A paper describes a structure:
NDM-1, as a typical member of B1 class of MBLs, possesses two Zn(II) ions intercalated by a nucleophile hydroxide in its active site, which is delimited by flexible loop 3 and 1023. The two Zn(II) ions have been validated to be crucial for its hydrolytic activity to launch a nucleophilic attack on β-lactam rings in β-lactam antibiotics.
Au-bound NDM-1 was first obtained by incubating apo-NDM-1 with 10 molar equivalents of AUR overnight at 25 °C and then co-crystallized using a typical sitting-drop vapor diffusion method. An additional Au ion (Au281) resided in the interface of two protein monomers coordinating to Asp223, Glu152, a water molecule, and a Glu227 from an adjacent NDM-1 molecule in a distorted tetrahedral geometry. The occupancies of the three Au ions were ca. 0.5 with the Au283 in the Zn1 site showing slightly lower occupancy (0.45). Overall, the data agreed well with our biophysical characterization that the Zn-dependent hydrolysis function of NDM-1 was inhibited by AUR through displacement of the Zn(II) in the active.
Residue numbers in the entry: 42 to 67, 71 to 270
The structure:
């Protein structure tokens, strides 16, 4: 079910949803994002690690979907999620991130997105800051992998994207905690689960999609950090 296109891998998850995967030698580390077809347009969640890889995402979209990319949202200011911002801006694609991601971007070595999302006290995106997001339902679960990490449900499907906050249920660790909030991580993981309570396919940055057990297993590992 995987399609190789250049050095990237694309996998269809639902009629209008694909997972994009790019690799960086750190051996090679995979990072996943999403592509969503919404009527006559395409929406992207996360860049690839690099500008060149992100340009290949746009090329794959042109070939396999052939609809314009209306916007991209990136889920925190680290290289695996935001390293390819320049390719999006070069193509004239409107980009969105948590306001905090944009504020942190220079210190993290990332190019800021063009637009900033803000959030209610319950974590839901303020809709005026998510214009024409279509099926993308953005939720800020609280600090976890980073203080700025956001998550995205795909309305009309069984899919929710946890980004780097959620690890699969076979994970032995919580990955890179160098920028993490170890106090609040567990509650943030549980908040993601409660925000998308009917999602059955959990997509994440560094594992293949998993069931909801990924959320609970992650939260229970994060319980041990306190
Ligand atoms: Au990260
Ligand atoms: Au950092
Ligand atoms: Au990551």
């Amino acid at each position: 079910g995987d399609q190789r296109f250049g050095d990237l891998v694309f996998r269809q998850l639902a009629p209008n949803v694909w997972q994009h995967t790019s690799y960086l030698d750190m051996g090679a580390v995979a990072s996943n994002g999403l592509i969503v077809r919404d009527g006559g347009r395409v929406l992207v969640v996360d860049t690839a690690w690099t500008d060149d890889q992100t340009a290949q995402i746009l090329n794959w979209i042109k070939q396999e979907i052939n609809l314009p990319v209306a916007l991209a949202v990136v889920t925190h200011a680290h290289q695996d999620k935001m390293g390819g911002m320049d390719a999006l801006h070069a193509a004239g694609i409107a980009t969105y991130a948590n306001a905090l991601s944009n504020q942190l971007a220079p210190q993290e070595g990332m190019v800021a997105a063009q637009h900033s999302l803000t959030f209610a006290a319950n974590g839901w995106v303020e809709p005026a800051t998510a214009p024409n997001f279509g099926p993308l339902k953005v939720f800020y679960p609280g600090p976890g992998h980073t203080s700025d990490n956001i998550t995205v449900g795909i309305d009309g499907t069984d899919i929710a994207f946890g980004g780097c906050l959620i690890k699969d249920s076979k994970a032995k660790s919580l990955g890179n905690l160098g920028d993490a909030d170890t106090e609040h991580y567990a509650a943030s993981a549980r908040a993601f689960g409660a925000a998308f309570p009917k999602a059955s396919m959990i997509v994440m940055s560094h594992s293949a999609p998993d069931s909801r057990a990924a959320i609970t297993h992650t939260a229970r590992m994060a319980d041990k950090l306190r």
